[PDB]
C-alpha cells in the first residue's frame, strides 16, 4: 500500500505499519539483529525514528 498521492515525494514506497522495532520478536535471529529486521524485507520510512535506541510504540500495561 503506497502513501496517498499528496505530492510529498513518497511515491510507491509502501506504508508499513507504524510499529517500532521493540514490538518485533526478540527471540528470533533477525538478519540485522540490532535492527530486528530480516534481509530483503521492506524497511519502514521512519526506521531511524523507530529503532530500539529511539521512540517506542510498544503496548503499555495501562
Amino acid at each position: 500500500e503506497p502513501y496517498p498521492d499528496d505530492g510529498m515525494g513518497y511515491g510507491d514506497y509502501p506504508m508499513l505499519p507504524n510499529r517500532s522495532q521493540h514490538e518485533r520478536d526478540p527471540w528470533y535471529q533477525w538478519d540485522h539483529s540490532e535492527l530486528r529486521m530480516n534481509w530483503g524485507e521492506p524497511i519502514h520510512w521512519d526506521l531511524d525514528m523507530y529503532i530500539r535506541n529511539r521512540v517506542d510504540t510498544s503496548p503499555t500495561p495501562v
Binding site: 520478536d25 526478540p26 527471540w27 528470533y28 535471529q29 500495561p61 495501562v62
Partner: protein, 178 residues
C-alpha cells in the same frame, strides 16, 4: 531461538503461551513460593475446567476473555530473567562476541602465538570448503517446486555429509566468550 516461527500460532499454542505468561505474572505478583504454588494450582484448575471444550468458537471467545483479564491484571514490572530480553544481562556480552573471521585478518606473529588452535582452524576451514558445494546441491535438490516453503532446513542425508548452512550455527560466538 533454535526453531523458526511458523506462519501462524495455533489455538493450542496460544493457549499454552497464555498459560505460561499468566503463571509468570502470577509469580511476579505472589513473590513467595507457597503463595505462588497455591494460586498457580488455582490457575491450573481454571484452565483444566475450561479444557474440555468442543465447539471451539466458545473456546476462542473464552481465550479472548481470558487474555483480556490477563491484560487487566498483569504486573507492571513482571519478573524477567537476566538473560531474557528486557532483562539486565541481556546483550551484555555482544561487545565481547567477536566473530571468528578476524582470525583471518590476524598477523602471522599473532597466529604463531597459537599454532595448534590455528592449525585446527584451517582444518575446519578445509572441511567447510569441501562441504559447501554438496550442501548447496542438497538445498537445490530438496527445494519444493511449489511456492510453499518454511524457514526450516534439511539435515544431512548420507554419511560424510554436513547439514546445509551449518557454519553460522556451529561457529557462533559463545554466550560466555571470556
Amino acid at each position: 531461538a533454535f526453531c523458526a516461527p511458523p506462519a501462524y500460532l495455533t489455538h493450542q499454542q496460544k493457549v499454552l503461551r497464555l498459560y505460561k505468561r499468566a503463571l509468570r505474572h502470577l509469580e511476579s505478583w505472589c513473590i513467595h513460593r507457597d503463595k505462588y504454588r497455591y494460586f498457580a494450582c488455582l490457575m491450573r484448575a481454571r484452565f483444566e475446567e475450561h479444557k474440555n471444550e468442543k465447539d471451539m468458537m466458545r473456546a476462542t471467545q473464552l481465550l479472548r476473555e481470558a487474555e483480556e483479564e490477563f491484560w487487566q491484571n498483569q504486573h507492571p514490572q513482571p519478573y524477567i530473567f537476566p538473560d531474557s530480553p528486557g532483562g539486565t544481562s541481556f546483550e551484555r556480552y555482544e561487545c565481547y562476541k567477536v566473530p571468528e573471521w578476524c582470525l583471518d585478518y590476524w598477523h602471522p606473529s599473532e597466529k604463531a602465538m597459537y599454532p595448534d588452535y590455528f592449525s585446527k582452524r584451517e582444518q575446519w576451514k578445509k572441511l567447510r570448503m569441501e562441504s559447501w558445494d554438496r550442501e548447496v546441491k542438497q538445498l537445490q535438490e530438496e527445494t519444493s517446486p511449489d511456492g510453499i516453503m518454511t524457514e526450516a532446513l534439511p539435515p544431512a542425508r548420507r554419511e560424510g555429509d554436513l547439514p546445509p548452512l551449518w557454519w553460522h550455527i556451529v561457529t557462533r560466538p559463545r554466550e560466555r566468550p571470556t
